[PDB]
Design an enzyme around this catalytic site. Sequence first.
Site, PDB file in Angstrom:
ATOM      1  N   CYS A   1      -2.343   0.867  38.642  1.00 14.49           N
ATOM      2  CA  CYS A   1      -1.428   0.404  39.712  1.00 14.49           C
ATOM      3  C   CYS A   1      -0.920  -1.023  39.538  1.00 14.49           C
ATOM      4  CB  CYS A   1      -2.003   0.554  41.123  1.00 14.49           C
ATOM      5  SG  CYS A   1      -3.711   0.114  41.433  1.00 14.49           S
TER       6      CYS A   1
ATOM      7  N   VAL B   1       2.985  -1.758  39.900  1.00 15.07           N
ATOM      8  CA  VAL B   1       3.574  -2.708  40.836  1.00 15.07           C
ATOM      9  C   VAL B   1       4.416  -3.785  40.144  1.00 15.07           C
ATOM     10  CG1 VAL B   1       3.067  -4.424  42.663  1.00 15.07           C
ATOM     11  CG2 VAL B   1       1.880  -2.240  42.630  1.00 15.07           C
TER      12      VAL B   1
HETATM   13  S1  CLF Z   1      -9.012  -2.838  38.526  1.00 13.35           S
HETATM   14 FE1  CLF Z   1      -8.314   2.538  42.183  1.00 13.35          FE
HETATM   15  S2  CLF Z   1      -8.571   2.906  40.171  1.00 13.35           S
HETATM   16 FE2  CLF Z   1      -7.006   1.502  39.319  1.00 13.35          FE
HETATM   17  S3  CLF Z   1      -5.195   2.758  39.321  1.00 13.35           S
HETATM   18 FE3  CLF Z   1      -4.671   2.311  41.301  1.00 13.35          FE
HETATM   19  S4  CLF Z   1      -6.336   3.282  42.582  1.00 13.35           S
HETATM   20 FE4  CLF Z   1      -6.672   3.865  40.486  1.00 13.35          FE
HETATM   21 FE5  CLF Z   1     -10.463  -2.685  39.885  1.00 13.35          FE
HETATM   22  S5  CLF Z   1      -9.476  -3.128  41.450  1.00 13.35           S
HETATM   23 FE6  CLF Z   1      -9.179  -1.012  41.348  1.00 13.35          FE
HETATM   24  S6  CLF Z   1     -10.683  -0.771  39.836  1.00 13.35           S
HETATM   25 FE7  CLF Z   1      -8.749  -0.976  39.133  1.00 13.35          FE
HETATM   26  S7  CLF Z   1      -7.395  -0.449  40.713  1.00 13.35           S
HETATM   27 FE8  CLF Z   1      -7.883  -2.647  40.121  1.00 13.35          FE
END
Ligand code: CLF
Lengths: 522, 522, 466, 467
Positions: free
Chosen positions: B152, B156
């Site tokens: 994501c 974004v």
């Molecule tokens: S680093 Fe959660 S897993 Fe991702 S792609 Fe969008 S939903 Fe899927 Fe850390 S904080 Fe979270 S784990 Fe990644 S998204 Fe960033």
Amino acid sequence: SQQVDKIKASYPLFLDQDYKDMLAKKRDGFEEKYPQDKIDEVFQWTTTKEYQELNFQREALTVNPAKACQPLGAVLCALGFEKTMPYVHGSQGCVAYFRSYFNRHFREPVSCVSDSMTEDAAVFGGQQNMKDGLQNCKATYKPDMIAVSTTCMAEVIGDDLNAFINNSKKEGFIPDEFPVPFAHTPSFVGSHVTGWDNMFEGIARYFTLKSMDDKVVGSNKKINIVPGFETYLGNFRVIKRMLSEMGVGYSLLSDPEEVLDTPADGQFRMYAGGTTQEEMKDAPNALNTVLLQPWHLEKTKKFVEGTWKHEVPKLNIPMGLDWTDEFLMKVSEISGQPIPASLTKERGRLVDMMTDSHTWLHGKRFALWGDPDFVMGLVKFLLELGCEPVHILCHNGNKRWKKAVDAILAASPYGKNATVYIGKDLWHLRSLVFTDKPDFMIGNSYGKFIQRDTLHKGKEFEVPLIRIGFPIFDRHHLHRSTTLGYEGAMQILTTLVNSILERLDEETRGMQATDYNHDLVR
Amino acid sequence: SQQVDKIKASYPLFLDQDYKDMLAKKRDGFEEKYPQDKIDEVFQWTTTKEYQELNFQREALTVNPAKACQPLGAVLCALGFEKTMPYVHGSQGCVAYFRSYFNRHFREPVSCVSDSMTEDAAVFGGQQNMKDGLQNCKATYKPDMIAVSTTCMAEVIGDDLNAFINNSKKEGFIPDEFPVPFAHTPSFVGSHVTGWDNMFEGIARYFTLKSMDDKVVGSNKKINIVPGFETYLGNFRVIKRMLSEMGVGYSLLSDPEEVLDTPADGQFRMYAGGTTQEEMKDAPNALNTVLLQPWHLEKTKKFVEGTWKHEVPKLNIPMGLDWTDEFLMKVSEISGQPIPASLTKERGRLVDMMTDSHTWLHGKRFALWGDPDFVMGLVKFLLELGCEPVHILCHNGNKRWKKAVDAILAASPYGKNATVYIGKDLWHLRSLVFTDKPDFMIGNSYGKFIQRDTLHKGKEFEVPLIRIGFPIFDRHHLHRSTTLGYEGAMQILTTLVNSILERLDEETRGMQATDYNHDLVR
Amino acid sequence: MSREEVESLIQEVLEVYPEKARKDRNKHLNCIISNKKSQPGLMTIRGCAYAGSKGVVWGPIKDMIHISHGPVGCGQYSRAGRRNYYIGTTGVNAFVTMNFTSDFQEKDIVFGGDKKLAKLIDEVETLFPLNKGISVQSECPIGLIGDDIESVSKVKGAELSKTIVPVRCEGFRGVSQSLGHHIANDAVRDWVLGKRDEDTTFASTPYDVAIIGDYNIGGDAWSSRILLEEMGLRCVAQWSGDGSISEIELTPKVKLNLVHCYRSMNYISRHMEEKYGIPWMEYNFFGPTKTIESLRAIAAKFDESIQKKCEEVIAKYKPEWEAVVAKYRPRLEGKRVMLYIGGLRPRHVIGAYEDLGMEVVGTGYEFAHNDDYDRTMKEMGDSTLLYDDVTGYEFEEFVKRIKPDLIGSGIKEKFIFQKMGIPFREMHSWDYSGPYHGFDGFAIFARDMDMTLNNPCWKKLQAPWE
Amino acid sequence: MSREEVESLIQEVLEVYPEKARKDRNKHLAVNDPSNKKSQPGLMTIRGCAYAGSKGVVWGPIKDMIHISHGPVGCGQYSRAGRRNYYIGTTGVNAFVTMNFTSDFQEKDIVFGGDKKLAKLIDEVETLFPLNKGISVQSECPIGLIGDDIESVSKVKGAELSKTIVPVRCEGFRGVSQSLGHHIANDAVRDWVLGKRDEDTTFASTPYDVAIIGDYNIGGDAWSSRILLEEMGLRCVAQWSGDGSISEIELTPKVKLNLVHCYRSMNYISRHMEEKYGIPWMEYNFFGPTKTIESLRAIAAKFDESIQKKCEEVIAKYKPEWEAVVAKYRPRLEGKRVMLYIGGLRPRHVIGAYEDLGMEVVGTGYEFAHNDDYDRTMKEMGDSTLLYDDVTGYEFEEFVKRIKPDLIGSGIKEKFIFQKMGIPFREMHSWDYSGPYHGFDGFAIFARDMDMTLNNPCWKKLQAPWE
Ligand code: CLF
Ligand code: ICS
Ligand code: ICS
Ligand code: CLF
Ligand SMILES: [Fe+3]
Ligand SMILES: [Fe+3]
């Protein structure tokens, strides 16, 4: 009373107040029942080491046996041949019972006849019964072969099966060349496994004893496989599947797997598949004969070695990792076939599952029972899993067998707390799981009554049953499972780990009490 | 304290009186815990229809979801190709989680990289990350192909994957011919299944789009099979098995069977099996393409029809009796291969099991959940068994799907008490199993906490979980099972009847209380 | 299916047989003969005298230990085969689901088992103190080898002040389970029933009755009893279904014996009449019509009070059984059933089927006598099929031509007809459902016939590409 | 295996890398002689993100608060139940640790912001979960990238509802690993929770009040620690994130000493309570008898004679117990060699427990440690043992192939690799669904687990008798 939308069957109908009341009155007036406090007291007594010692002193009373009688095994053996009617010469009661017992385990039709010997025959013998019997059976059910065994009535009065069959031929009731092998199968000797052995060897003898002059050990370049008393469809199936993927020519003598699994397509098929008469006749030409369940195929061994001149390999039942390896390598040796990449990988997957699941299986304690070959294979696999086969019971086991198993135990630190019991029954076992409580029983459905007893002593004393064996009557379609080979090992392994993990989930399902350890990931 | 011969793990170590006291003191002293009577009151309130209405009015808060995000599926799709590294462009935390989640379900290694975009890439984009990432991966892990997906973060900030990959080739970070198919897989659109679809479609486009000028629909004489997001090894193997039985040339796109089940033989294999790049290139030449899970393969369908020119058949997921029948007949049609005797038998053996088990299955009420295709197949099958799929929940389902399922339900008397829920979650379902209590749930491991909640209300309200779905983390090796085909239907049936019978054995295991109905034979 | 049509079927089927068998089987196929030996080799569905005695009459008696005396087979195959329900603590004070056996090995056949039976009686006494009596159910070898289980019983019984009942129900006696019942009725009469002939301690009331021949299959006796006590009567005993020894001993004090299973229990009933003046009557508690008819007949035997209460009960359950017919009858209307069961049920359930608008187009019994068939012709429709001791071949061939919508028979028949596509219900074990007796039983019976006969699976036997 | 053998191994492995990766990774691999950088793209780091460190580690364990995985569905789903931080409670009523609360961002929230959705949710949390004692909003990647102001929402809603609502900006793109997550989390406790009772004179403190800082109670680890300190006469007012409550945290400023287990994750807050409340902190180790004993003794030394002596009693009590576990396992594990790779504490702290079983740690390494962690580590390892920071999958596989350790202790992503290679593996994060491993009672389990795996009959059955 019933609600038309929510009809209660026996459970829980009789918990309804008016029934609870009605049963309370019935008891207290008329039943003259011992008072509950006394009942409880006797129950605790029956769980003690004191009771156990008396229980183990029984010489005359058997309580909850873990074997059946000979002709049952003969019938199962017989059903494994192409278009064969099993025929038990003696009284009909037995046949109703044999059929029902297997009907329940397989949830399939089980075809078998009797000659219906009565009081009259007790005095004068069962010749006429054999005469009209064979003729009637042949005409009515049109088998290609009739395989004759006996009930204890016929044994006790001493009917000469051979003469009786010969006189039915002589006297024109059945054609001289209609196949009628026989075996005497006394219920007072050995058990159902013995009955299978006797029947197989009768059928083997019938088809080969005279023809031996043209037989060349090896000329058809097949290996014969004799399965023994086998009640898992997956076991017949896995042996064939492995031998085929290895490119090994083989001849499964006595295979019931089609006739014990016949599609529901609008027809009833009385007969299906099975070993052909041609295969039994051609069988001495095989390279060798392998006995899958050697501890109840003694007579068959003697005949195969003594008459067919096959050097029967000393193989254990192919259960567990080592015995499946030994099996495939012996088969490789005789056939000249290499063990294919697919089998090598399947074994690897099996060992993978062992590495993943070892932490839960480690040191888990089991009580177990069943037939001699099944029990030792399962002991063997338990040890390989790092589990402790604490109570090993085989009602129909013999002294030599008990030695063999004690040697298997002796070779593992996991066998250190294990004891093998021969000639003992499930009421003996019920004391053992009280006084030296294991984590699980591995057994047949009769085991449920032991679990019920352990539960009654208290939740913390309950020993759950893991249903592996015969008969399994109170679950559906387990007869379709496998216990042999890597495949069977994978299934057992999964059932064990998962039974352990279900039990722990039960024990940790207590909100704010035990749930702290109700993990999502295990 | 520990006793060195009976070491206690967390359960039941913390049940020891000294621990119990310590925990009570912790609470009373420092936690300022709500009084238990308040807690009980709130718990009872959370089981009411009043809580439920309010629970169902939620618009912003999701509690206990039954879906995961796009790149999870993209990774699973990618692992299905030969010697391929799944690569997710974005933040690394995601890859640690994708790899752990599947590691827990399969018990195997799950290989996948990130290009570790940090704070700085958030401002200037992740171009250098793609350049060094690709090169480093190619050199270190030596895949024949790298399958690029996105987190994501990278969504974004709007990174142009296509440009970056072309610039990496252009700057010589990886050779021009090296396959680097890509897909944008945003966690805020649809779910894990969408990521599968997006990824597959990206890969199909990559090997095919600019090559169409020489593809003749039908010249290789095969059917392509696109499995979709699939976490049961059996499902993969059952498909190929059935097609091989029919003599049907096929080309299963995206096989992750091998690499999700490598043997433990002293070496770790990072890649294994999978669909070859040559299969993907040749895939337009196929007679047609069948989508095993069409409700999450919409993008793939458009591409296969629109560009490959294949008339993708209107088939449901091959689950249960009718839909396996339709699958087989369609395959027969397309390939001119007759449905062989073995599949006819196998189907009738399933039908036979149905007849044997119908009395226990009749009218059993189920709550269930999962992905859209999985759910509708399980719904279908339940109806075929004479069961009632009373609460049907699919968090990631869409309106058209819901309509399709309500149609299936309308077509059966056993659908009358059933409601389909889309966009709802396991906290929603929790209400439903309290207020309109079914007999069992069919779901993934997250269900255990619902069963725990129901038990807390009381034994009579406990709704047992039957673990079918993804993820299953608190049992071992169920990932090996099958839910597709007659095989899968056989497994599901067996698991349903036996869950029913075991629960009944539990309820009738009360000595002198309920064990009047503790039958040996069922 | 017309009458000339039925007779034509009968003759056609018989033509497979050799002549001897053909002539005998013709005699057994609305007249008819019954209770004769089975033709050898023809796959009779019958059991033996042991099944009739241990399996059926004695086995249910919860507080005695029943010894399957002989080799290991019999006891084993009959362990908990029959759903004779009981309340008790099994293994301590109740023993019905256990298998006790003398497990004969060769030494016992060659030298006799009488000393081993004496030794095991001692062992039973050690390990199961709360037992109220022992019965010894002989299997085939006991009589053949010339053992005297009577001396052992009399000697050991005297030695221990315990009722020990020797039963000569060896499977070679008789032609079926039937003689087993009789041997078992005579064994009760000779070793149990007279024990309290000198006892004045039981306060009899004008409303004492006993249920004679309800083996409580799935709770059937319990759902029968309730209704009799809700009618005002006191059921002093239930014979062999959740039955206890003291009950059986108290049966000499009752005013009336309520005979459900005529076949198995008439023997002891007739005897109680001769020896104690206690009259007996037959009834039926299968379906609303019959239970209504029965409750009334049994009540009309007493006075007015019992007759008002009878009419109360009838009204008290009219909502319930009418809800049941309303629900289930339109689902089962005009459906045709073929039955085959033992010695009662093949006539007794006919009315219950008719209450759901079904027609019994065929019925027959394993081991009935002619008196049972007399009773049976009244209940059966004109031109329907009767079969005594049907053979496997016959039953299959009859069903192929008759094409019934439902078949109601035993475990050895079940899977045959299911593969043929015909809904099957087990009308011995009630397919692990029931009770089927009384009004509460009717509800379940109705649900069960519908669930099976209208099951979605029966639409699916034919493959769509075929 | 010697000194320049380990050095040549390192070079051998690094030869596969492109030059930039080579040069970097070289600085991250050392040989011992008694960090905190970005991972190189594409090299299969075992590292997690700042969200893992904040939500997964620090806040998640807090029992009676609801934590919102704020952003898309992934993050919160994969972490749901992921970690074994144990706790006593009624889940879904007064405790919420194993539940996954999320704002489940869809595209409209990305395009227009989730602050509105967050305010709505907070109300929904309040109606449906009335016994919650506070909320935290754990920001996933998009929240910062998107320009939301979770702080504003937190202040406003907190004000309105009179709840402690903690905004936590632990988006996964921040920092290089879960390490910065710890620091962000510590700061968020500091700014929004820890001061709440600054003016409460009401807590009846004693001279023996301590707090367990940095024990997340994995398999009950904190519980088996507590019991021992309690038996030694101390009062634990608070357990920091392992069966922890918000009130315990708010009370932590009243204690006499902060006992820090996990230095890495909680030194930040310890430093702060030192500066602000004057509370001193000290590091301790409760892995194995040796370390537990010296820890109990160092802690006791901080108090008055009664405590020194209860300490000696406690030590005497457990003597026979721990001494028995060794006599039974020691002979089964002595001389075996262990390679470890874990996160920020246990790679160093789990050496003494191994040595109490006669085992040696021949290699160790951390995912996200800083150089103060490595300073501490060098004290504990032998000369010429292998050190690896942020090891790549490749490097690790290669080190194992050369060193051929008898046992490897690492995480779930490493487990199945080494098991297939035939090396006994124990998970050293989740205590492989076993534990606790802390304290004297934890030593018994640790001993039994190392033994059952390493001496398991399965490891002899890898190679087929025919090849
Ligand atoms: S680093 Fe959660 S897993 Fe991702 S792609 Fe969008 S939903 Fe899927 Fe850390 S904080 Fe979270 S784990 Fe990644 S998204 Fe960033
Ligand atoms: S006793 Fe008889 S065979 Fe009357 S031996 Fe048999 S539990 Fe049947 S038709 Mo099984 S004469 Fe009872 C019977 Fe009827 S066992 Fe049950 S069902 S009413
Ligand atoms: S908090 Fe840290 S990674 Fe100190 S983020 Fe990690 S429950 Fe590890 S080495 Mo998993 S710094 Fe705790 C840790 Fe150590 S999750 Fe646990 S095991 S002692
Ligand atoms: S008719 Fe009836 S059932 Fe038969 S034996 Fe006779 S009483 Fe008994 Fe020896 S062979 Fe085996 S054991 Fe028994 S079943 Fe037979
Ligand atoms: Fe069947
Ligand atoms: Fe694995």
